[PDB]
Amino acid sequence: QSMKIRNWIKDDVPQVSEIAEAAMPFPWSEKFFYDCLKSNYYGWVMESDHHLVGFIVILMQEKECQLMNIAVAPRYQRKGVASQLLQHALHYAKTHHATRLLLEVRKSNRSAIEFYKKAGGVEIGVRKNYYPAEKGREDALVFNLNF
Numbered sequence: 001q002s003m004k005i006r007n008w009i010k011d012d013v014p015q016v017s018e019i020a021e022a023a024m025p026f027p028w029s030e031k032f033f034y035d036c037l038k039s040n041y042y043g044w045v046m047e048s049d050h051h052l053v054g055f056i057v058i059l060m061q062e063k064e065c066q067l068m069n070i071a072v073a074p075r076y077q078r079k080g081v082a083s084q085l086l087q088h089a090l091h092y093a094k095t096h097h098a099t100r101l102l103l104e105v106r107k108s109n110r111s112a113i114e115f116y117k118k119a120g121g122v123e124i125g126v127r128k129n130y131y132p133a134e135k136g137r138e139d140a141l142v143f144n145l146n147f
């Protein structure tokens with residue numbers, strides 16, 4: 001019943017990448033998660049049942065914030081894990097003078113879309129043919145969350 005939330009560290013990347021492989025359509029490589037270890041990128045992980053079950057990564061840029069990725073292992077979904085991770089991330093962003101969280105997500109990524117909408121996210125635009133798809137390209141929906 002213990003649950004731990006903390007900033008992520010380089011040792012977390014293999015499990016984070018495993019969560020991505022399990023949960024995210026078109027998942028980031030292990031090397032993509034090293035890529036946002038660098039400055040202005042901030043991450044958190046949740047530990048439940050003695051292992052990592054979800055992570056969230058934001059980018060602080062200009063005066064506002066971008067949600068780069070959020071994912072929860074499928075066996076731990078629909079229990080509030082992402083909700084808690086997002087709350088922790090938004091507390092950090094709000095303390096660092098941000099008020100709007102940007103998310104870009106594949107049009108077909110239903111779960112991330114419905115999650116963000118129930119957190120207060122609002123669609124503000126579409127980037128057509130923004131992601132590579134198995135054939136052709138896939139639109140990105142663009143959401144804003146005020147906080």
Ligand SMILES: CC(C)(COP(=O)(O)OP(=O)(O)OC[C@H]1O[C@@H](n2cnc3c(N)ncnc32)[C@H](O)[C@@H]1OP(=O)(O)O)[C@@H](O)C(=O)NCCC(=O)NCCS
Nearest residue numbers: 023024070071072077078079080081082083111112114115
């Ligand atoms: C989106 C995601 C992180 C949600 O994680 P989670 O821990 O299950 O989310 P929560 O339990 O905190 O969600 C909260 C509310 O979101 C809504 N919702 C969440 N997932 C949903 C889904 N798959 N389908 C429909 N509604 C959903 C629910 O209304 C949920 O509230 P409830 O549990 O009271 O029913 C998870 O589906 C995931 O990892 N998806 C793939 C990740 C991804 O694609 N990342 C890249 C784009 S950011």
